[PDB]
Write a protein that binds this DNA or RNA. Structure first.
Length: 227
DNA sequence: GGTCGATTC
């Protein structure tokens, strides 16, 4: 995906993740407050280094000096583990981006309708990410990407790809530095949350413009002509 | 060496 919401407190996401390792993240009850998180901004990103959990603001986008196109923001789970470009990130740069849900735009002719997608059980999500370590250096070009997967079941009607969303136990496993690239692939295949676990609904077209940042951007909208 | 966000006063 290329847009999501990360609006609640750090402890809301961290309590669900339920890490048992030392946390190097100070207590902060203030909501992050972002309802329209866009590529090319710094995003709070979870990772594990020195056996400790860290939360760093990392650029969403990845463009090495040799890359002469716009920065990539997604990496396909089908190929990233063996990609010449993505393999080092898959091996050493795994991370987690937590969120309330994400946005997708459904082409309905020459008109695109945004939907907000989120867990049917009301819980937030952990999106699998890969990126350039060390994350704490604040690199302006080599940040992170959200791993994507084929849309399954109901989601393919909205759009053909989806973020790789991991259940909390798999998000913990994903971040561990001790596991191999092949093990990470097994975690991606074992912890991916199926589409029937999500709910989705149209939202205001205003979310399309990244200048718009209100909490109403995830609120649903009834779209019948006759009302 | 790749991928799917909109917007463009």
């Amino acid at each position: 995906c290329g847009r999501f919401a990360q609006s609640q407190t750090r402890e809301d996401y961290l309590a669900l993740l339920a890490e048992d390792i030392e946390r190097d993240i100070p207590y902060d009850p203030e909501p992050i407050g972002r309802y329209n998180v866009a590529p090319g901004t710094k995003v709070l990103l979870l990772s594990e280094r020195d056996e400790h959990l860290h939360l760093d603001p990392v650029f969403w986008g990845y463009a090495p000096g040799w890359w002469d196109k716009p920065p990539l923001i997604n990496a396909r789970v089908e190929t990233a583990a063996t990609s010449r470009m993505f393999k080092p990130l898959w091996q050493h740069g795994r991370a987690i981006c937590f969120a309330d849900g994400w946005f997708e735009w459904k082409k309905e002719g020459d008109k695109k309708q945004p939907f907000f997608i989120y867990r049917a059980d009301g819980q937030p999500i952990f999106m699998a990410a890969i990126g350039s370590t060390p994350f704490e250096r604040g690199d302006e070009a080599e940040g992170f990407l959200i791993v994507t997967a084929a849309a399954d079941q109901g989601l393919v009607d909205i759009h053909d790809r989806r973020p790789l969303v991991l259940s909390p136990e798999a998000a913990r496993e994903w971040m561990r530095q001790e596991i191999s690239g092949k093990e990470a692939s097994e975690i991606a295949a074992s912890g991916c949350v199926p589409a029937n676990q999500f709910s989705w609904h149209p939202v205001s077209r205003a979310v399309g413009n990244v200048k718009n940042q209100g909490a109403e951007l995830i609120q649903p909208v009834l779209e019948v002509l006759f009302q």
